[PDB]
Symmetry: C6
Subunit: 205 residues, 6 copies
């Protein structure tokens, strides 16, 4: 990534083997569960476009997924050119294209240039925004079942049902009461309006 | 987080993959056991609001819990605005809202600004206070059984009973004697008043 | 590798035991699966030719593979000499041969010289390009089956078929529709032209 | 803790996730075996009172134990006040109470102040002394059996008996000969006085 | 080892517990497989003779091996004296003997002196050359079977045979065709001369 | 330990949790196998007497052993006083006793003083010498069987016998031929005198 030294200067640093290992393992073990996204964002703190491609290209499985991502990334590159066309001067910075932000037509040297520029063109963050929009589309896609089929088991503790409800709800981005079992529906109906989730859960314990 | 370099200056540092891994694993293995809280507080030393959201958003399970937390965080944002309303000047700091402290309406850039300000507005610590108040409410909620149902087994060693008693007592935040078995109740009654826990446990060995 | 200190200077650093361990483990567990290549490239960031030989020479198995690599590396050394022949001056830099870039006839001292030169002769990157061209030839070679034999199981979920299709396709570097089962072929044929992979997969869910 | 930078200054540093993990694991696996204490002391090198509370508060089990510790810590706070009563001046240091050394009534800011003072008030070491005196009381308490019941098995190798003897002896803080079996008692009696443990063990091999 | 600080100076650094652990584990798990040597060389980057003895002396098994190594090291010490005899001056450097390079008759202080000298006497690299020549002799010795007994199974895939061939060949430091099975011998004979290993393997797939 | 910063100065550093973990694990898994000693020496590089006590006091088992060590350490303290008696001056260094080198009667402050003195009194190395002499006595003691009972199995490969021979020989600190089986004795007798171990082992393969 790009990080601050101890003497203030912004400088390139090899992506750590820890960071490389963590991303591949998280993908192995959680596929496209929604919590995976903030894990990506954190593990890619200060990342060059080169670093971002490395993290995506190290995934062995989920290639239907990594192909939809390319589709999404390209749609975002086109839109970028549409908004910032381009026409260089010896030892002068060249403006970036869509394909330059997504690191396919740019060098690490240019990427370090733009991101450390004063003022900086933050190509790492622009690309990451594109990637995250794409990973979100995939998460919604790979949610195994709909919020409509999340109903509480007649013998299912309220808390464990809420957990299923808001798990599903997060993947897809008073239905809680509707889908509740009759025993707990009864108590919730009685609580009146403007009940907090804490109160709802207390009540049904 | 924000940490001191070696040359004195306060500067931003990527949250470590070790720290990211430790929090998710602790939540996996201890759920909302009370000891989890000081583990959160320590693992989030020097954390920006961005860092705090990352640690919460990396949890995959316990979404009933992470939803009550939002409820608690929002109640605290409202109370913040109630106490510090707001109305910016070119390249000048803008005062923070409730949603700015909780990192939903603020940039990492602004967060670094406030926290490194001279004097600093410590938005990281203010947010963490909010989160911890919320995690406490959850711990009390998820205590499996009441201190009233903690009674010593007729064949249960005193020490292992005390451990159950003060485990329960910590989750909920001479009852010890009341709930003791008759053999050990007898000895404790005899010890008279102002007996230390050490003496109580010695006596019953 | 060669890395920047904290005071700006470009300086040699022992290859870390973490990096040494990661490469050998990745080769143990993924053989010449295509995702292995970007893992090599990342783990060898800033690498001297000496460092590159170390990473290759630490592999115990796959010696048919590591022999084809030598064949490829030598073909690239010849081509290098063909393009940059050579004829030294006391305490002056000597131009590098093919065998010098591939680190067989050069010292670590000379390698540090060329790579830190102003302007630098980047022998590490030139060699890595050679190695990667060679590892690619091997990946294609060790793809277990052809894209032609990737057809969807009559009871195989579309998503899991796409994953097999683009796994195979990556190793080898509307056939998707051709190879689809009849139920899903039907729906895809109906979608008309210019359908995105996301739409294709949605449709077949 | 408080540690020296590279430029000499004494400065605060987040407690490492390694250190956090090591203490909790050691307690999991060795309970209050006597060797645990020097492990605590080492893992808490340079620790603020805040750091010390964090290490204690991260333990989930052994709450009878962690309650006796509070009892011991409070007895030591009282004794501290008894010896150093207190009565502040704008931007001037306030003398610490018992509860300030044990980090319950003090800020991290004040703790950093006292410990980096010239001359320093070493509140970290004063607290640690209190804690260690308390953990010792617990170790003695949780020694499973008395030195009197450590006798050598008629078919038990001398060395393995000595190990049991000095294990027990350390937990509790020519009895060796008394408790020896008759075969080895015989040889030891014969060795005369002023025999080294090495000679004793040699003799009985 | 000896490493560069951040301020340029060459300075001594404790051998890391990671490096200590890695060498012992590699020896545990691969014995004197040829790939072990480049692993030694890399793990001992910048090593003092003291560091080299530490790495050898931490091996518990393979003592027939570690004794042949001493034999080889001593033969190299004699040859060193034969080539550089010796006859010191207050606070002046004394020339090194064979036993000084191999770290048996020298202090760490002297080793740091020679290796940081301007110009440096690189006793670490001279010793490592000796050790590696010795470890090579051992690898050849502990090759389980001869290249002559590497023949392709009638039902053995060509690739897996090449792997056995070049594994054996590396330990010992158109025989491929000779030893091939008749089906694959046939195709290889037909390929004519100057066939690349890639072509040979393609052909036999 | 005491280590060099990046700015040259010799300064105290907390013993790492890695180093703490490595020593305890090595003792768990190898007891007093001779290879354990160089592991101790390396893991305790730059160690204060305080650091040395920490490493010994973290061992839970082997207390017969750790008691003989105290016996040995005390014998060495007496001998030290015998050789360097003592009689302090305000803010002036006090000469060390036997008990000061072994860190029982000295502060970490004094230990840092002596070891960083110009010229330094190296109390860490003096103590470590004492400890190592003691651990050696223990290794010899805990060698399970004598070199006299190491004889080659009639069906035991020569190499595996040499390994047993020199394992035993190292613990205790042409007998090889004597103890050889008759088949291999025969060949060795025939080799004549001045045969290298390599030749001996070659011959018997």
């Amino acid at each position: 990534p790009i990080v601050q030294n101890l003497q203030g200067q912004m400088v390139h640093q090899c992506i750590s083997p820890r960071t490389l290992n963590a991303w591949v393992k998280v993908v192995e073990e959680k596929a496209f569960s929604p919590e995976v996204i903030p894990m990506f964002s954190a593990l890619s703190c200060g990342a060059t476009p080169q670093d971002l491609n490395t993290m995506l290209n190290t995934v062995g499985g989920h290639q239907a997924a990594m192909q939809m991502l390319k589709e999404t990334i390209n749609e975002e590159a086109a839109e970028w050119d549409r908004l910032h066309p381009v026409h260089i001067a010896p030892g002068q910075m060249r403006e970036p294209r869509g394909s330059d932000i997504a690191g396919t037509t740019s060098t690490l040297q240019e990427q370090i240039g733009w991101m450390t520029h004063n003022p900086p063109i933050p190509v790492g963050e622009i690309y990451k925004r594109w990637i995250i929009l794409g990973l979100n589309k995939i998460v919604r896609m790979y949610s195994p079942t709909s919020i409509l089929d999340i109903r509480q088991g007649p013998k299912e503790p309220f808390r464990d049902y809420v957990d299923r409800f808001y798990k599903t709800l997060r993947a897809e981005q008073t239905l809680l009461v509707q889908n509740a079992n009759p025993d707990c529906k009864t108590i919730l109906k009685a609580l009146g309006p403007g009940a907090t989730l804490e109160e709802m859960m207390t009540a049904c314990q």
